[PDB]
Short mmCIF file of C-alpha atoms in Angstrom, two decimals:
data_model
loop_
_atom_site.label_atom_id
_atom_site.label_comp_id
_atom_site.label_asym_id
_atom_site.label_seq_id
_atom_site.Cartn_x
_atom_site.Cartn_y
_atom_site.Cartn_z
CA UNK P 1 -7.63 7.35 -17.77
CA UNK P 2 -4.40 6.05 -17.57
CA UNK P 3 -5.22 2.75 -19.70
CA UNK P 4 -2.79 1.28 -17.36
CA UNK P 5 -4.89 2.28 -14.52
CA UNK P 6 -7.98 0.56 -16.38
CA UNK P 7 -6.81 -2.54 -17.17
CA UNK P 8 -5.17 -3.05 -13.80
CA UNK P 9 -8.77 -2.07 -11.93
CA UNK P 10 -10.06 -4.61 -14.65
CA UNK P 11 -7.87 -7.73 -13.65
CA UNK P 12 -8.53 -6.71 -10.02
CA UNK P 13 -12.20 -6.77 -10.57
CA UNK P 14 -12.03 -9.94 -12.40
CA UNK P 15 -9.76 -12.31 -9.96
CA UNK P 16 -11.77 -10.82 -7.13
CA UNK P 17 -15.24 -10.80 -8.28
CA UNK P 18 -15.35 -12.04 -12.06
CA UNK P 19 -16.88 -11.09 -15.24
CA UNK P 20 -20.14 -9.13 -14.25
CA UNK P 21 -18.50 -7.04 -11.36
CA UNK P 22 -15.36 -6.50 -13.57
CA UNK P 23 -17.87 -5.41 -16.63
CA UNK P 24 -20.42 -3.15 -14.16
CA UNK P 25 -17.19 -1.62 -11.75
CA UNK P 26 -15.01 -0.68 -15.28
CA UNK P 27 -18.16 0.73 -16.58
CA UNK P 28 -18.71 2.76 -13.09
CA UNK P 29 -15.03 3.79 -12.93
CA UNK P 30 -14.62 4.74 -17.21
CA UNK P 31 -18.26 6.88 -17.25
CA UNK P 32 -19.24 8.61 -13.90
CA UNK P 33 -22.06 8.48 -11.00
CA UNK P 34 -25.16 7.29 -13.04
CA UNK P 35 -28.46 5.22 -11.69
CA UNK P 36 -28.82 1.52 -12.10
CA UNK P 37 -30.84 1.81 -15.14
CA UNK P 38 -28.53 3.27 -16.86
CA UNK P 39 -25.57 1.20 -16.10
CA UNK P 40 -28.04 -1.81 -17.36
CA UNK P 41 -28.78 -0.08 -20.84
CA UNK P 42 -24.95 1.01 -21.24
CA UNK P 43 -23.37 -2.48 -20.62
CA UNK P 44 -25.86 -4.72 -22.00
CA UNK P 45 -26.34 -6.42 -19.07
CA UNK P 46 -30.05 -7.04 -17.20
CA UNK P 47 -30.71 -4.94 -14.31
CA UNK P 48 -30.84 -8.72 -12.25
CA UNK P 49 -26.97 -9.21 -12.89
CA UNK P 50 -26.33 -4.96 -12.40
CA UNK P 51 -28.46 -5.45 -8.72
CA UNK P 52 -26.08 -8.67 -7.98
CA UNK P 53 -22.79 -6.73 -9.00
CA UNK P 54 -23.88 -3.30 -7.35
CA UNK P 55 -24.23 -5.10 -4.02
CA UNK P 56 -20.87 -6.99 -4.27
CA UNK P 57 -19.10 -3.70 -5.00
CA UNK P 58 -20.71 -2.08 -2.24
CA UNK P 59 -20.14 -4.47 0.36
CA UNK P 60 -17.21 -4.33 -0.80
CA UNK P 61 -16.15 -0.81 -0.62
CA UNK P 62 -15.91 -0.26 -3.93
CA UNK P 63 -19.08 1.28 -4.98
CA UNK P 64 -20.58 4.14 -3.02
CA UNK P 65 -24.20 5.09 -3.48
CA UNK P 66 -26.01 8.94 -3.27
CA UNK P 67 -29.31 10.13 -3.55
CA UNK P 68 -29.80 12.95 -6.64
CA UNK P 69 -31.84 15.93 -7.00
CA UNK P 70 -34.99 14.19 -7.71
CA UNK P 71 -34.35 11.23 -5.71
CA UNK P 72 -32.76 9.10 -7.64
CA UNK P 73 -30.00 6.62 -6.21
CA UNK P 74 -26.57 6.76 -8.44
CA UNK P 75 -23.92 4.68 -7.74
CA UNK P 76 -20.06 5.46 -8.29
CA UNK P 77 -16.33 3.86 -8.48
CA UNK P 78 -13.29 5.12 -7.91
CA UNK P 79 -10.28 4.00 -9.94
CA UNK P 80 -7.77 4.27 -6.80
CA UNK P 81 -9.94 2.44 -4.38
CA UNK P 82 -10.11 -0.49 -6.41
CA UNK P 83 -6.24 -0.06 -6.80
CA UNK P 84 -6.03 -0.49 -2.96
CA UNK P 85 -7.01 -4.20 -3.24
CA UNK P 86 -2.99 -4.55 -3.57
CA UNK P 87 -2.25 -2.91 -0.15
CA UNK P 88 -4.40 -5.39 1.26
CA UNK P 89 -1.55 -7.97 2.17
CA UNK P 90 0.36 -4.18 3.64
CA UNK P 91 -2.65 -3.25 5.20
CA UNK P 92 -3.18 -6.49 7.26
CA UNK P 93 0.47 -6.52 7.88
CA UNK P 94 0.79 -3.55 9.62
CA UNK P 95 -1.76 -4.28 11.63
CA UNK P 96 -0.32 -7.05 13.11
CA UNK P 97 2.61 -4.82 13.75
CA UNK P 98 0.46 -2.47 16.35
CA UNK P 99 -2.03 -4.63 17.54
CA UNK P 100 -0.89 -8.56 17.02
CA UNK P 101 -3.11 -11.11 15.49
CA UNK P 102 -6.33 -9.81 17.38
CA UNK P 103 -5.97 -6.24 15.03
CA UNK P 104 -4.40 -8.42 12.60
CA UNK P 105 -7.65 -10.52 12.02
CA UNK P 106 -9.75 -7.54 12.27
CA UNK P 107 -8.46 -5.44 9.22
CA UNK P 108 -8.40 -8.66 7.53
CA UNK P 109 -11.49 -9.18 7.80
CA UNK P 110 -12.99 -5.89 7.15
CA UNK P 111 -11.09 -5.59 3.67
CA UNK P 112 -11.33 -9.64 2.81
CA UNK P 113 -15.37 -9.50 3.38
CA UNK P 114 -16.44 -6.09 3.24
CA UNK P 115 -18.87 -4.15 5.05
CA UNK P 116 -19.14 -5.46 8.71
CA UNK P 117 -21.04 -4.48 11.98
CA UNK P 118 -18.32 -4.46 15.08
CA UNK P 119 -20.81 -7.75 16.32
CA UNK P 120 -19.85 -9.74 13.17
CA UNK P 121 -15.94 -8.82 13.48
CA UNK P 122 -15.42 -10.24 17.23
CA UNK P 123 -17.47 -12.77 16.83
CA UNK P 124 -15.33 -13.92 13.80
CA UNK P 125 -11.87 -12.75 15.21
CA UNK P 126 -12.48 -14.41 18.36
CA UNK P 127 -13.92 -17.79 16.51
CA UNK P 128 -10.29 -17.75 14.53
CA UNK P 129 -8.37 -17.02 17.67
CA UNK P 130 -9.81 -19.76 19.08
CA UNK P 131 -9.22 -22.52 16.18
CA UNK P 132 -5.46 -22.01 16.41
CA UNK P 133 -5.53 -22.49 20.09
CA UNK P 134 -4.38 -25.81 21.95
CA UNK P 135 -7.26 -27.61 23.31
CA UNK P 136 -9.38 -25.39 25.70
CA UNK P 137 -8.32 -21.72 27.18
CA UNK P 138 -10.73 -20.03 24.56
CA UNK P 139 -10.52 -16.19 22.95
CA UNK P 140 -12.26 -13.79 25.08
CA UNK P 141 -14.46 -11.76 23.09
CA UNK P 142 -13.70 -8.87 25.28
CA UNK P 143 -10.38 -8.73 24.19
CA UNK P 144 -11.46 -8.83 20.66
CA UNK P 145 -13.56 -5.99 21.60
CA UNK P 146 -10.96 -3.86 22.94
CA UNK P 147 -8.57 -4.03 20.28
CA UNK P 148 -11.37 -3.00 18.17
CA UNK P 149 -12.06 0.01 20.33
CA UNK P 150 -8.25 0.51 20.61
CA UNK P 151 -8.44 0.46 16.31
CA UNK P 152 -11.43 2.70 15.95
CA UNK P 153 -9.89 4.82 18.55
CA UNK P 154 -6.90 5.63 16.88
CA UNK P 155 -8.87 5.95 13.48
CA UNK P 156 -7.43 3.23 11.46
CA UNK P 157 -11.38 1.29 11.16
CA UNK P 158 -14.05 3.88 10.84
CA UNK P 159 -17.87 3.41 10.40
CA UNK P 160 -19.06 3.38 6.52
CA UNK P 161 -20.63 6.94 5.87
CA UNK P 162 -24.46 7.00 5.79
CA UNK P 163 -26.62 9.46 3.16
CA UNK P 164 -25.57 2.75 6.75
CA UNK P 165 -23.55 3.88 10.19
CA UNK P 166 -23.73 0.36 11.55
CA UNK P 167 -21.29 -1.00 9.51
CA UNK P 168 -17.57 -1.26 10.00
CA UNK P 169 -14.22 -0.30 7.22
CA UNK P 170 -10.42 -0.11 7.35
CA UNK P 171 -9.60 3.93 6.69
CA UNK P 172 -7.26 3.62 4.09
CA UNK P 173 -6.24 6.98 4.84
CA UNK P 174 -4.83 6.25 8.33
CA UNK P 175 -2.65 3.81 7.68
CA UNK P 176 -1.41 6.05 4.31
CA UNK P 177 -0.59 8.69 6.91
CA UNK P 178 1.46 6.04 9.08
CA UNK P 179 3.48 4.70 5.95
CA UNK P 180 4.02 8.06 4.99
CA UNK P 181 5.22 8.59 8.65
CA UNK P 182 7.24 5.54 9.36
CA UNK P 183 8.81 6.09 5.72
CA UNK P 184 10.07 10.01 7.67
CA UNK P 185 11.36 7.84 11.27
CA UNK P 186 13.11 5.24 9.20
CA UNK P 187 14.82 7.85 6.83
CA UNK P 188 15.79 9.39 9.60
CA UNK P 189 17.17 7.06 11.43
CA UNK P 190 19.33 5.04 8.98
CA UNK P 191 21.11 8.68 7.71
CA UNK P 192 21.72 10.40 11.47
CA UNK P 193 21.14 8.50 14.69
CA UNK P 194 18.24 6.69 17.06
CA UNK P 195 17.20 9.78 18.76
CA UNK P 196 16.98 11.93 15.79
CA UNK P 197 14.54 9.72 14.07
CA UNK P 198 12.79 9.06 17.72
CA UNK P 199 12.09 13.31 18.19
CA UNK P 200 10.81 12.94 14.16
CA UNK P 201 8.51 10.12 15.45
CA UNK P 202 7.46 11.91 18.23
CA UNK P 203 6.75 15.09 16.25
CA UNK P 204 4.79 13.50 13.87
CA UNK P 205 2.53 11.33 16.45
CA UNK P 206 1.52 14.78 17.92
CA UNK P 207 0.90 15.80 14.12
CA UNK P 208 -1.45 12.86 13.50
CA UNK P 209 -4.88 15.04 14.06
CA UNK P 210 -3.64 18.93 13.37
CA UNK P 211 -2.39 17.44 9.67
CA UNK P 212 -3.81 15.83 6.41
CA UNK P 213 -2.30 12.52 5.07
CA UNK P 214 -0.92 14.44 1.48
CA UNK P 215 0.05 18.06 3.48
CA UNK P 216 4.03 19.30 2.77
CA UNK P 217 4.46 20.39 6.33
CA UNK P 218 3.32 19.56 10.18
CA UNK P 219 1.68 22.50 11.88
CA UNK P 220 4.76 24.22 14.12
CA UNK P 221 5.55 22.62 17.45
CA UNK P 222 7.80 24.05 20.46
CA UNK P 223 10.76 22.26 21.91
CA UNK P 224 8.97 22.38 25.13
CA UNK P 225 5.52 20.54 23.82
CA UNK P 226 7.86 17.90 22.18
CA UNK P 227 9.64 17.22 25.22
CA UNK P 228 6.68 16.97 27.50
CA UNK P 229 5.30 14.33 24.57
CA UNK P 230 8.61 12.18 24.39
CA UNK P 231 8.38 8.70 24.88
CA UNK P 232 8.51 7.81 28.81
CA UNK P 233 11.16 5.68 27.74
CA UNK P 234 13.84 8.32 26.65
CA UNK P 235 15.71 9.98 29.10
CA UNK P 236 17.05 13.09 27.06
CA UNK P 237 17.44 16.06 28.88
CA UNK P 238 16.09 19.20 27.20
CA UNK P 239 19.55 20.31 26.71
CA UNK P 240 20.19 17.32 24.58
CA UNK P 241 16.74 17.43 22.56
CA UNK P 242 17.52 21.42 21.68
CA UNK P 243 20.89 20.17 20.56
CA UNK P 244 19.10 17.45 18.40
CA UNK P 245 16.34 19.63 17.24
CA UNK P 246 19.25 22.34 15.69
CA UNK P 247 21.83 19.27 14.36
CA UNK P 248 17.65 18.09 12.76
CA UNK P 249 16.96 21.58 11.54
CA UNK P 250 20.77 22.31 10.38
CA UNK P 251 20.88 19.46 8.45
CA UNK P 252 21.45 18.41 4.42
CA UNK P 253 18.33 16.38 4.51
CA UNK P 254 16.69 19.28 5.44
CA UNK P 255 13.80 17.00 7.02
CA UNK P 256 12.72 19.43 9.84
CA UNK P 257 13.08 23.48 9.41
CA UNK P 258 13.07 26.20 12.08
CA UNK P 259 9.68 28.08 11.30
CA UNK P 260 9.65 30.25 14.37
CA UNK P 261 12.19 31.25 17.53
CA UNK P 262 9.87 31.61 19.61
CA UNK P 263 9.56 29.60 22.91
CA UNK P 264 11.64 27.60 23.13
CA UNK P 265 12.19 27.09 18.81
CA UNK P 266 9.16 26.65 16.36
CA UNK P 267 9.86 23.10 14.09
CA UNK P 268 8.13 21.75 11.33
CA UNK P 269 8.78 18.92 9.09
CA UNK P 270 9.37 19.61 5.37
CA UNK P 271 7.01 16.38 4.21
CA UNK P 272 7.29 17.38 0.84
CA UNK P 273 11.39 17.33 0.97
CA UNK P 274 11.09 14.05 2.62
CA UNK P 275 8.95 12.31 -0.18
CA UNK P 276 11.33 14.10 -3.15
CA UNK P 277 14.09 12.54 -1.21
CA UNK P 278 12.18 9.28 -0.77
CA UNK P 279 11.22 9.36 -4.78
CA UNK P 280 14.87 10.26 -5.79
CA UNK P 281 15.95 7.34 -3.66
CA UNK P 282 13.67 4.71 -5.14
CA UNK P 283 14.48 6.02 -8.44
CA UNK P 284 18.05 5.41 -8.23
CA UNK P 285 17.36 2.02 -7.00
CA UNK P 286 15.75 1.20 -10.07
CA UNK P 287 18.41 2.64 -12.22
CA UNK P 288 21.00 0.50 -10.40
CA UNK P 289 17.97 -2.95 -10.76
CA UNK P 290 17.97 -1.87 -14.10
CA UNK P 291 21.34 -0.55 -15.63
CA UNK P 292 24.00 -1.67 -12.95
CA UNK P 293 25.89 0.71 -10.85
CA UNK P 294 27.92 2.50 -13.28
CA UNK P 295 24.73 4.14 -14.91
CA UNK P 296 23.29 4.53 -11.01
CA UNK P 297 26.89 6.42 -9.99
CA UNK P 298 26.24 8.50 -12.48
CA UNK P 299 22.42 9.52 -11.98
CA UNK P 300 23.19 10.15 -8.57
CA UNK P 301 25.68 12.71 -9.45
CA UNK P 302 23.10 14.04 -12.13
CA UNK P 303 20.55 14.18 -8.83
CA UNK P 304 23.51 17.01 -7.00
CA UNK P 305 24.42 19.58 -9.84
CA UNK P 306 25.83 20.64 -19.32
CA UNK P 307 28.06 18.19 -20.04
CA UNK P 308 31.09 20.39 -19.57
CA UNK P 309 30.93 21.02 -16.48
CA UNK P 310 28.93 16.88 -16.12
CA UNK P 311 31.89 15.26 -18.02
CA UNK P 312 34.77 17.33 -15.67
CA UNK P 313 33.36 15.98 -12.60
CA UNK P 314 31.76 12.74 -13.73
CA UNK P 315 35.19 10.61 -12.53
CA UNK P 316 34.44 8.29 -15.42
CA UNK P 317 35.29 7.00 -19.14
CA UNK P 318 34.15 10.06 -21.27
CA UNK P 319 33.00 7.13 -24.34
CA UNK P 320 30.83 5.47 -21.58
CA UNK P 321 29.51 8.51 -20.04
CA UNK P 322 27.83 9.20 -23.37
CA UNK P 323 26.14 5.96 -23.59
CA UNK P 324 24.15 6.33 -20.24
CA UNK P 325 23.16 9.52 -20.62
CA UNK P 326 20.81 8.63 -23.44
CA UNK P 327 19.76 5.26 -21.65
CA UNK P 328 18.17 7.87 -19.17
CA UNK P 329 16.89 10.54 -20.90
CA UNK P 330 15.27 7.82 -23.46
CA UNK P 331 14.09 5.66 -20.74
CA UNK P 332 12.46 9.25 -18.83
CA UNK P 333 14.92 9.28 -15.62
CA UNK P 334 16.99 12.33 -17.29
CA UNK P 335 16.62 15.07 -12.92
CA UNK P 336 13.55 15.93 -13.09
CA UNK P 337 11.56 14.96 -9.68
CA UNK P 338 7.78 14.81 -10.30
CA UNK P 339 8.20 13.65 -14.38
CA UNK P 340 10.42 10.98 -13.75
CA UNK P 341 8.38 9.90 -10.40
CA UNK P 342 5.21 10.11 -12.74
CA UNK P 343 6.25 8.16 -15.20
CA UNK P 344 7.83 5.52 -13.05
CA UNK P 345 4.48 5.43 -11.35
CA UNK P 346 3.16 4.67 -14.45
CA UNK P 347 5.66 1.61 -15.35
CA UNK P 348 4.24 0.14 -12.04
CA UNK P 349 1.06 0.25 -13.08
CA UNK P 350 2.36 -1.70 -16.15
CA UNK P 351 4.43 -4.19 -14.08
CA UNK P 352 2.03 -5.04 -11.40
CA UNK P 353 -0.86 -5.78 -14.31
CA UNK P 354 2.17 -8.09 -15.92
CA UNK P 355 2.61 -9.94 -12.86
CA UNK P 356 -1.14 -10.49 -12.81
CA UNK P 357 -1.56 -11.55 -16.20
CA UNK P 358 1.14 -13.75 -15.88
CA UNK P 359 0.39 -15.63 -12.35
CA UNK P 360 -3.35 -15.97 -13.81
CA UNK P 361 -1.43 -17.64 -16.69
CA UNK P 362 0.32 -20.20 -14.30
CA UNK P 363 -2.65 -21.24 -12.84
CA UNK P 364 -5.00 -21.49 -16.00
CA UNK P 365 -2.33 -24.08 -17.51
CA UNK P 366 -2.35 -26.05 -14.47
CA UNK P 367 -6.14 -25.70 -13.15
CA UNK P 368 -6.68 -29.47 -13.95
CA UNK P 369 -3.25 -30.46 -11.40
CA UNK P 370 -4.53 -27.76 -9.03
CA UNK P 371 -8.01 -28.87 -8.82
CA UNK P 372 -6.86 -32.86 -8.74
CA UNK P 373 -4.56 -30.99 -5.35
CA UNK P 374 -7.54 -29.21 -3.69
CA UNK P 375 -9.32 -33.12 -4.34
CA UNK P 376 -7.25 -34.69 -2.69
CA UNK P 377 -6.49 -32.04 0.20
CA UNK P 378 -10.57 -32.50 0.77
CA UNK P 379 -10.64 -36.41 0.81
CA UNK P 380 -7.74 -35.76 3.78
CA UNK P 381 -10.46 -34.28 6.09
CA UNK P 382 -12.57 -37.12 6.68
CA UNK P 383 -12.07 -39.38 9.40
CA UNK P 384 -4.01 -45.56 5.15
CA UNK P 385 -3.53 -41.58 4.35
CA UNK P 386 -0.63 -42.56 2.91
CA UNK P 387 -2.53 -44.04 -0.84
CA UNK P 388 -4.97 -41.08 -0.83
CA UNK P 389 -1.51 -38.85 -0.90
CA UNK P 390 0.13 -41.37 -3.61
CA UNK P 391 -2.74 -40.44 -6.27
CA UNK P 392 -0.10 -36.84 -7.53
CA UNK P 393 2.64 -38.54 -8.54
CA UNK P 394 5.80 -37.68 -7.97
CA UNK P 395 6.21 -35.31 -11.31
CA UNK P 396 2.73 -33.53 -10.37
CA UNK P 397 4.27 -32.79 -6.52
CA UNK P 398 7.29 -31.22 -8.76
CA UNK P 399 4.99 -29.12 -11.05
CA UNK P 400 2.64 -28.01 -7.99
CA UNK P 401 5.60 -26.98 -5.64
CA UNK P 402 7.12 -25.45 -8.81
CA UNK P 403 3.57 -23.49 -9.55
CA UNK P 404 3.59 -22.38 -5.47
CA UNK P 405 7.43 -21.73 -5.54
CA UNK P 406 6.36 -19.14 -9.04
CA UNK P 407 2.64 -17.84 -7.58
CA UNK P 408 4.92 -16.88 -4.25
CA UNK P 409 7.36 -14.95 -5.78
CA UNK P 410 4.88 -13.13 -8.14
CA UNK P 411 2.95 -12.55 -5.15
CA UNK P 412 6.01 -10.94 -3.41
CA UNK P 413 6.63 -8.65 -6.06
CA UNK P 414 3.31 -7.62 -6.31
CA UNK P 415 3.98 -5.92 -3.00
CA UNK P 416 6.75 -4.70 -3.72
CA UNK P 417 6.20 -2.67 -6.75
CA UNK P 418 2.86 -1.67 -4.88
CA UNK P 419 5.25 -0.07 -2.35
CA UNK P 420 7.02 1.84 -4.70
CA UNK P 421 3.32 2.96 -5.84
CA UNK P 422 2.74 4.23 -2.29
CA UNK P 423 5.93 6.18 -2.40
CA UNK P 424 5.42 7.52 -5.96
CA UNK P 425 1.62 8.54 -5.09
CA UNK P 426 2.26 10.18 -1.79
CA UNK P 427 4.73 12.32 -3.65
CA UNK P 428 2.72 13.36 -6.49
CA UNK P 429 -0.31 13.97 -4.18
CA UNK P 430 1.84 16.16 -2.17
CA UNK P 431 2.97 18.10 -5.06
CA UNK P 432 -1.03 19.74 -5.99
CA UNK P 433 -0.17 22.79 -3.72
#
């Protein structure tokens, strides 16, 4: 389907939802739209448990439903949706980043619980504000409300589609189109300068509704529209932005191209060259994570330009030259782009549903210490503390620390490699032109 792909939406489904779900949203994702009755029949499982799962997976977001030519309701499941469940932790993040813990709480939410009328968010938003703050003051449900607007506004939470409207979801596809710019800015800025990237931020901000999420170019802009749109904060004269906008265009990134000239200079930005670049750049950073930086030297010289002419300007032991070249054509990296980024996508796959498998493992052998933990966490609540505290000895505090200190770092790489996924996706969307 990829079978990496299944048995990553499979351990998803399971640690989320558990056996049922996991057995009804495989079944969905592995064999197509089909009515409840048929799901039942194909699984073995009675249409009570199918109605139980289907509604879990659809409040969810995971399951969508449509009505058939003669009237029948079938259900579907898409693979990549349920693959999402690892941007959660990015998703919420980057919410805080634009809207603080008020948008923060409200993505959260949304993705943590499901399907959600605007009502139920700020009245649970504002109820957690309100928790964390120091006796009286209160969260102002009007402020809740306004970030909301501020979110829907700006299309990153959309109502669910109807075939219903009421409800309330995180669009995925928003913040994929700000990773995808902010991945551009900051590319930009670490190779040229601050107000190089800052005219590439600006020029994609005024590309956010004229272009798709997966599209290889922004539709052309003037110098004169982008300098009306700058930031009020900037102070660049439009002397100094057609200055930047050539030293952007003439450039060996070649991030932003001259499509026009024309008043005052047609640019667009060459998406597709920035995700290759992005790709090539991630790739090499697993060549170095993987075979040091002799073998990542020499990829990166591959990723420029026969051995003749390889071996002549390699700058390197001919007798160890030899022996990294087949490292990387064995191990798929020897450059081509899309094959290499494909199959590295594909290693993720493998290494996130590792970390899974293995974290799951952690806390099966210990459920008996973690459950004696959550115990006596509980008996802590009610209203000395000290003996209540003294029942995990002192090796059990060692093992449970140990098993956070393990979960943690698992956790963090799960991230991680999931934003390597983002990167690896985006390009190979991109490239179905």
């Amino acid at each position: 389907m990829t079978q990496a792909e299944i048995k990553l939406c499979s351990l998803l489904l399971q640690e989320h939802f558990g056996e049922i779900v996991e057995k009804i949203g495989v079944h969905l994702i592995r064999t197509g739209s089909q009515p409840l009755r048929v799901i039942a029949h194909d699984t073995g499982t009675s249409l009570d448990q199918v109605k139980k799962a289907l509604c879990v997976l659809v409040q969810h977001n995971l399951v969508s439903y449509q009505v058939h030519k003669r009237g029948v309701v079938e259900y579907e499941a898409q693979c990549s949706r349920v693959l999402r469940m690892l941007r959660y932790p990015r998703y919420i993040y980057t919410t805080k980043t634009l809207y603080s813990d008020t948008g923060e709480l409200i993505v959260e939410e949304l993705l943590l619980n499901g399907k959600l009328t605007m009502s139920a968010v700020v009245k649970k938003v504002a109820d957690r504000l309100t928790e964390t703050m120091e006796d009286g003051k209160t969260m102002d449900y009007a402020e809740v409300s306004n970030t909301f607007v501020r979110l829907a506004d700006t299309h990153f939470v959309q109502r669910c589609p109807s075939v219903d409207g009421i409800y309330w979801q995180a669009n995925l596809d928003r913040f994929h189109q700000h990773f995808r710019d902010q991945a551009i800015v900051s590319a930009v800025a670490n190779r040229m300068d601050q107000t190089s990237s800052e005219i590439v931020r600006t020029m994609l901000r005024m590309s956010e509704i004229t272009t798709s999420s997966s599209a290889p170019f922004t539709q052309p802009l003037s110098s004169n529209e982008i300098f009306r749109s700058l930031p009020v904060g900037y102070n660049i004269s439009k002397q100094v932005l057609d200055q930047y906008l050539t030293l952007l265009a003439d450039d060996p990134l070649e991030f932003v191209g001259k499509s026009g000239d024309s008043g005052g200079g047609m640019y667009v930005i060459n998406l597709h060259k920035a995700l290759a670049s992005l790709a090539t750049a991630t790739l090499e950073s697993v060549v170095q994570e993987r075979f040091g930086s002799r073998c990542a030297r020499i990829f990166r010289l591959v990723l420029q330009k026969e051995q003749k002419q390889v071996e002549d300007f390699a700058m390197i032991p001919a007798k160890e030259a030899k022996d990294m070249l087949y490292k990387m054509l064995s191990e798929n990296f020897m450059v081509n782009i899309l094959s290499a980024a494909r199959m590295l996508l594909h290693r993720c796959y493998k290494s996130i549903a590792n970390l899974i498998e293995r974290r799951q493992f952690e806390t099966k052998e210990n459920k008996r210490l973690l459950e004696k933990s959550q115990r006596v966490e509980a008996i802590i609540a009610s209203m000395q503390l000290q003996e209540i505290e003294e029942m995990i000895t002192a090796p059990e505090r060692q093992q449970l620390e140990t098993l956070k200190r393990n979960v943690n770092k698992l956790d963090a790489s799960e991230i991680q490699v999931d934003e390597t996924i983002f990167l690896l996706e985006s390009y190979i969307e991109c490239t179905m032109k």
